[PDB]
Amino acid sequence: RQAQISNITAAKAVADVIRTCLGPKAMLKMLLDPMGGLVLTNDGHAILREIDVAHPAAKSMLELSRTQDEEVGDGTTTVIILAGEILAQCAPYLIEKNIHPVIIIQALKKALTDALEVIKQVSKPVDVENDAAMKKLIQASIGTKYVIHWSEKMCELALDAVKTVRKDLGQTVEGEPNFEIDIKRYVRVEKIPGGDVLDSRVLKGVLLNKDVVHPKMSRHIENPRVVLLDCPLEYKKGESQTNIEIEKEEDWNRILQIEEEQVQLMCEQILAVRPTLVITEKGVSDLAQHYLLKGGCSVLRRVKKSDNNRIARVTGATIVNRVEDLKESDVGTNCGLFKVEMIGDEYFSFLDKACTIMLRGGSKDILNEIDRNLQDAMAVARNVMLSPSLSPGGGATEMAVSVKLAEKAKQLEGIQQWPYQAVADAMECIPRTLIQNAGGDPIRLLSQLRAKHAQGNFTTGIDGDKGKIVDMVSYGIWEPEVIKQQSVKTAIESACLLLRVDDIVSGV
């Protein structure tokens, strides 16, 4: 039984320390490094990565914080604390009460479904098509930051950034696509120095800094066709050992003729479909410029490989290695704008749910702070599109589950009834932790808040500024439901995996 105690105390020791990292009132922390420096920030994601742990259960809790931080911007410490308190309330039941661990694990799976149904009933509908309403939802992640001066412009910039990647489609034929929204790859941004923040627009496509390779060429094409390829256009060499030795004076003209033929033969493979544009991943020699000039196509070299995957979304061209294998299905037809016009003293290109957002600002240092601030702001707006529902903040959602769980568990009359009381106590520790940081009495404010759920609604939370029981809806405190769904599901799933290991094997 000592191994089960070590598994609980390993994850709880990490959760008990980060209890002060929750909420806007979160107290700062100080870690002692061997170097003279120290970590003054209260962010839990930065503190947990610098903490050295021994027992492997704490290592599994660190990997959970990395995955949770990628989905949503905030709420990282909420998942770790919630997963650690469940093991604390189940500690006397697993040891003293001698309850089998799978019974606790099986009960947590049943309580996970009931916890999600209560949150959906407490949540209220919200209009996702209102542009003025989405700016206020993002504003919670805007204010109290360096972007507060641009907050008026940041709400408009973050709005169009989310509206670009999202597309509303649904039906009962092919199922629910869930909009297929990815912040990492698709919403990936490229910071360009110069320009203006208000004039900054979101372009759909891939943006390249390479201009036309010919001095006189048409800068506007009606129906441009983007074509992707791998092997560059240039003089090739033999795959085996090649010995080139020029002795006679007339032998120099043989290499000059072969060099012109090898480039021309590679262009004939592209000209089969007669495309309006030629884009090469690698560089292009100057010999291929005159051959493709009469064909009515522009040559574009020096294209990254990672950007070719996003071009297939706006075009459809399939990546092909050998130039002879290029299919005619790769045409770039129905391209909106070909304009190459320079903006901000840098030559651009227009290829317009995948794209590269062009960021412009007063300097590079200004755009650096906007980077991490815009990514965390779009995570809140992404949760709004996953479902038209909002949840009360300040711990009201945490209290709504504990009230309905204790009343429903009494009607089941089974062995799982006992651990349900431990879950309800763990759900109340999240808002109670903010009470200990708010200066109020944790004993008095916990009993008075729980009694109001039986009379009033479940949307009444705790305010950090005041410290007394107040309504979250009337005073303008809201949080998305997706964070509440990911906080309950991932904490229960991670807590069950820690109880499945009854022995620690030492070996390679």
Partner 1 sequence: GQIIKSIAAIRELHQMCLTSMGPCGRNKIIVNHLGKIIITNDAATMLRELDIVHPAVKVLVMATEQQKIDMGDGTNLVMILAGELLNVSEKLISMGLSAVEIIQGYNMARKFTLKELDEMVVGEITDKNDKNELLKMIKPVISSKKYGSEDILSELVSEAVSHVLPVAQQAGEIPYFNVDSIRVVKIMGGSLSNSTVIKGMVFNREPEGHVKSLSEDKKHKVAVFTCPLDIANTETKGTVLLHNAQEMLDFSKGEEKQIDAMMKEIADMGVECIVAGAGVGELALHYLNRYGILVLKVPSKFELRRLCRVCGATPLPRLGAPTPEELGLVETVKTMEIGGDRVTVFKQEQGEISRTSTIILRGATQNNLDDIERAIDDGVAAVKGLMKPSGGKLLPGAGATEIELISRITKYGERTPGLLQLAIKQFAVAFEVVPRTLAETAGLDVNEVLPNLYAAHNVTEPGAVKTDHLYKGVDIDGESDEGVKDIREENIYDMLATKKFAINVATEAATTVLSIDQIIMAKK
Partner 2 sequence: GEKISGDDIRNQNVLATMAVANVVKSSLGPVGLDKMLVDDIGDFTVTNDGATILSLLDVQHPAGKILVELAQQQDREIGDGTTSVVIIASELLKRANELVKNKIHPTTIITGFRVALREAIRFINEVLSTSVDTLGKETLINIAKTSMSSKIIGADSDFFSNMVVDALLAVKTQNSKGEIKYPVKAVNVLKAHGKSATESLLVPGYALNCTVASQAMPKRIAGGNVKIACLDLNLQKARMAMGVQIIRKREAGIVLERVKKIIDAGAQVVLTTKGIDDLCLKEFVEAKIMGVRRCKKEDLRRIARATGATLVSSMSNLEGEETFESSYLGLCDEVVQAKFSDDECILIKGTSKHSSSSIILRGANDYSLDEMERSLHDSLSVVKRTLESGNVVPGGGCVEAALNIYLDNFATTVGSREQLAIAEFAAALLIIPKTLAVNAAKDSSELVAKLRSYHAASQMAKPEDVKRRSYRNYGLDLIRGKIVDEIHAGVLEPTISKVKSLKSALEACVAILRIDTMITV
**Could you list the residues that contact partner 2 (CB under 8 A)?**
56, 59, 100, 102-103, 172-176, 268-272, 274, 323-328, 497, 500-508
Breaks in the chain after (C-N > 2.5 angstroms)? 352
In the complex, the smallest distance separating the C-beta of residue 434 from partner 1, rounded to whole angstroms, is 15
Of 63, 87, 92, nearest to 76 (Cα)? 63
- Window 400 to 419, contacts with partner 1 (CB under 8 A): 410-411, 413-415, 417
Q: Residue 5, interface with partner 1 (CB under 8 A)?
A: no
77 is known as an active-site residue: yes
| Residue 43 annotated as catalytic | yes
| DSSP notation for 384-398 | HHT-SEEEETTTHHH
Does residue number 451 form part of the binding site for partner 1 (CB under 8 A)? yes
Token code pair at residue 233: 């256009």
Which of the residues 16, 352, 376, 471 is marked catalytic? Answer: 376
Q: Between 127 and 182, whose beta carbon lies closer to partner 2?
A: 182
Residue 439 makes contact with partner 1 by CB under 8 A:
no
Minimal distance, residue 470 CB to partner 1, in Å: 19
Q: Given the rule CB under 8 A, which of 92-100, 215-223, 234-242, 270-278 is the region that contacts partner 1?
A: 92-100
489: burial class by Cβ within 10 Å (0-12, 13-18, 19+)?
middle
Of 69, 74, 77, 433, the catalytic one is: 77
Residue that has been written with the tokens 């002060």 in this structure = 20
The reply on whether position 220 binds partner 1 by CB under 8 A is no
Residue 271 binds which of partner 1, partner 2, none (CB < 5-8 A, kind-dependent): partner 2
- Axis crossing angle, helix 364-385 with helix 151-165, rounded to the nearest 10: 50
Dist. CA 466–CA 480, nearest whole Å: 22
- Return d(Cα 363, Cα 194) in angstroms, integer: 6
Catalytic residue, candidates 76, 276, 459, 460:
76
Q: Which is nearer to partner 2, 138 or 492 (CB)?
A: 492
Joined together, the tokens standing for residue 94 give: 């697993």
Beta strand 460-462 pairing with 469-471: antiparallel
Stretch that binds partner 1, among 180-188, 315-323, 384-392, 437-445 (CB under 8 A): 437-445
Q: If binding is defined by CB under 8 A, does position 98 make contact with partner 1?
A: yes
**Catalytic residue list contains 76:** yes
* Residue 323 interface partner, choices partner 1, partner 2, none, CB cut-off 5-8 Å depending on type: partner 2
Report the nearest approach of partner 2 to the CB of residue 167 (Å).
Answer: 17
298's enclosing H/E stretch is strand 298-300
443 binds, among partner 2, partner 1, none (CB under 5 to 8 A by kind): partner 1
CB 477 to partner 1: min, Å: 26
Measured CA distances, 408 to 112, 115, 225, 399, 448 (Å) = 13, 11, 63, 15, 21
Separation between Cα atoms, residue 289 and residue 29, nearest integer Å: 62
Instruction: Determine if 368 is a binding residue for partner 1 (CB under 8 A).
Output: no
Contact partner, 272, from partner 1, partner 2, none, Cβ < 5-8 Å per class: partner 2
Question: CA 396, 402, 408 angle in degrees (round to 5)?
Answer: 135
Coil, strand or helix at 443: helix
Alpha helices (H) along 128-280: 131-139, 151-165, 252-270
Residue 434 has phi, psi (to 5 degrees) of -70, -25
- Nearest approach in angstroms of CB 91 to partner 1 is 11
Q: How far apart are CA 197 and CA 188, in angstroms?
A: 18
CB of 79 to partner 1, least distance (A): 23
Contact between 97 and partner 1 per CB under 8 A = yes
From 13, 103, 231, 470, residue interacting with partner 1 (rule: CB under 8 A): 103
- Residue the block writes with tokens 């070719």: 308
Positions marked catalytic: 43, 76-77, 376
Give the residues lining the site for partner 1 (CB under 8 A): 97-100, 103, 410-411, 413-415, 417, 442-444, 447, 451, 454
